[PDB]
């Protein structure tokens, strides 16, 4: 049918997005799907959208929110520059590593309950992970849950007197433990946030596995050298490291011992010059940012 075809159409494949096309806050990762048109289609203003894109647009990349609007225009910005940030990261050949030494999210590892010993930490995270929840929809998590949990009273009024009667007659320090486990055991079958929207690992920035060496005609590369720019002429206030702009990413640059004298000389125009850096490590934070650490390689 037409409905089946539509669901699989290329326009359907792009997930709904109404995030501001003009965002002036902190950008840590791509927010909009880049759309590309071939040169032949660009010559005919064809992008596979609802309407022709204005001929003024010469770029072959755009990002959009709405196919059509009440203003009879498409809401789009003729830019595709997050792809070059990803490809420049690939050229730097620095694998993303976990600063906490966690399991690789892209491998199906056999995990155990080592971290499941915090059942009361995360079972209540469902009601306590409400930092930005409505004052009454979050309050609907109190009566709606209370009835659901209160429907298991009979089951826990028999299991507890059949598996741990001593605790019911001695102390509740262990009873509370049997309660946290009970609900989780009766909730793993349930589906509360069964889909987790948190970023998985690198988020797609890099699928490179650590360990490989870079062979070169001049031997194996031991240190990666990448041109960059120093943004500030004074270390980040309260931090012992300056900031550099390397390959579309802002890194923390650590200097060997001293800061080159071009800093004082250039001053606030220090960003006008290009320096050579060495990328020590690259980490991923939970906000979806990349923590790139560099080193200002100076001619010596």
């Amino acid at each position: 049918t037409l409905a089946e075809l539509l669901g699989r159409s290329r326009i359907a494949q792009v997930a709904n997005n109404h995030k501001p096309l003009t965002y002036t806050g902190k950008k840590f990762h791509p927010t909009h799907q880049i759309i590309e048109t071939k040169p032949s289609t660009l010559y005919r203003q064809e992008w596979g959208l609802k309407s022709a894109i204005p001929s003024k647009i010469k770029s072959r990349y755009l990002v959009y929110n709405d196919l059509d609007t009440l203003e009879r225009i498409t809401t789009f910005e003729p830019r595709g520059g997050t792809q070059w940030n990803r490809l420049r990261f690939q050229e730097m050949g620095v694998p993303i590593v976990s600063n906490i030494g966690r399991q690789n999210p892209f491998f199906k590892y056999i995990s155990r309950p080592e971290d499941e010993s915090h059942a009361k930490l995360s079972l209540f995270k469902e009601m306590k992970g409400d930092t930005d929840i409505s004052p009454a929809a979050m309050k609907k998590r109190l009566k709606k849950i209370t009835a659901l949990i209160r429907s298991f009273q009979d089951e826990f009024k028999e299991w507890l007197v059949e598996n741990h009667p001593d605790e019911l007659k001695l102390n509740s320090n262990k009873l509370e433990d049997y309660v946290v486990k009970f609900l989780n055991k009766k909730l793993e079958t349930k589906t509360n946030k069964k889909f987790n929207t948190e970023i998985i690992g690198t988020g797609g920035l890099s699928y490179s596995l650590p360990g490989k060496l870079k062979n070169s005609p001049n031997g194996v590369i031991q240190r990666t050298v990448v041109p960059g720019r120093i943004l500030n002429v004074v270390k980040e206030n309260n931090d012992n490291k300056w900031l550099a702009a390397i390959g579309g990413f802002v890194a923390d640059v650590v200097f060997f011992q001293s800061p080159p004298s071009s800093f004082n000389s250039m001053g606030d125009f220090i960003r006008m010059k290009t320096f050579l850096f060495e990328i020590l490590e690259a980490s991923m934070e939970k906000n979806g940012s990349v923590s790139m650490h560099a080193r200002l390689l100076e001619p010596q």
Binding site: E36, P39, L87, Q90, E91
Partner: protein
């Protein structure tokens, strides 16, 4: 989707291979299998991108200057080179399937033998073939391609490539193997090439090269091993150069009429 081109007299090719060079099994490996292998990988690499609508020759030129598209470049270069090799070693370019033609006597044209003498200091075609066989054995340690090319100055010269090296674009000829040791003369050639690529003003850092291939010989293991075996690649190159289809090779030389 990039599909494997249909070849003239394909039923004969699948039964008796290419007489005097490859058998039926040898030709199935080089073309019916390897060409399918390359085209499928190219389609997977380029599907969903602008490159899907371009022929392999144009893809390699578009991607020749992009370091991170080398995988696409290698596939496009190999696909183009393989059909350049399979085309000049083919019994007949015309489809005599219903004409049952068994008399294809193709010989070097006068323009080809005139440019050979001019460019090789009077050397004959037979001597040039010996130089081509020698160049392949000493310059291509592993996989690669042997080409007889013509440049913008009307001079025919011999180019060898390592793995999938294009003859059209000198920055990607891959004629020097840097895994081994190089002489100061070879380093000078590389240093001079780097300077030329830096003189270009284009934001894509691309130069103009008008070199064009005339003869292509596949030096990959997919073409000779099964029929000749490890170490007998010089006997394979000799047979290829002696049984070339000169209707195709002559047409590759620009005449100007």
């Amino acid at each position: 989707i990039h599909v494997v081109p249909k070849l003239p007299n394909s039923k004969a090719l699948l039964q008796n291979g290419v007489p005097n060079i490859l058998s039926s099994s040898g030709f199935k490996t080089v073309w019916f299998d390897y060409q399918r292998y390359l085209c499928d990988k190219l389609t997977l690499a380029t599907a969903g991108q602008s490159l899907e609508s371009y022929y392999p020759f144009h893809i390699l030129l578009k991607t020749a200057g992009n370091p991170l598209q080398s995988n696409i470049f290698n596939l496009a270069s190999s696909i183009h080179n393989n059909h350049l090799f399979v085309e000049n070693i083919l019994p007949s370019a015309v489809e005599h399937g219903t004409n049952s033609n068994a008399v294809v006597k193709t010989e070097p044209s006068r323009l080809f033998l005139s440019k050979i003498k001019d460019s090789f200091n009077g050397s004959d075609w037979e001597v040039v073939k010996e130089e081509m066989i020698y160049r392949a054995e000493n310059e291509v340690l592993g996989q690669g391609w042997l080409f007889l090319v013509e440049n913008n100055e009307k001079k025919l010269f011999i180019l060898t490539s390592n793995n999938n090296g294009t003859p059209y674009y000198f920055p990607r000829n891959q004629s020097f193997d840097l895994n081994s040791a190089i002489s100061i003369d070879e380093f000078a050639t590389l240093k001079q090439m780097k300077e030329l690529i830096g003189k270009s003003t284009k934001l894509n850092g691309k130069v103009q090269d008008w070199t064009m291939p005339i003869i292509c010989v596949n030096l990959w293991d997919h073409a000779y091993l099964h029929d000749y075996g490890v170490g007998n690649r010089s006997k394979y190159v000799k047979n290829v150069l002696d049984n070339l289809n000169w209707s195709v090779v002559n047409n590759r030389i620009f005449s100007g009429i």
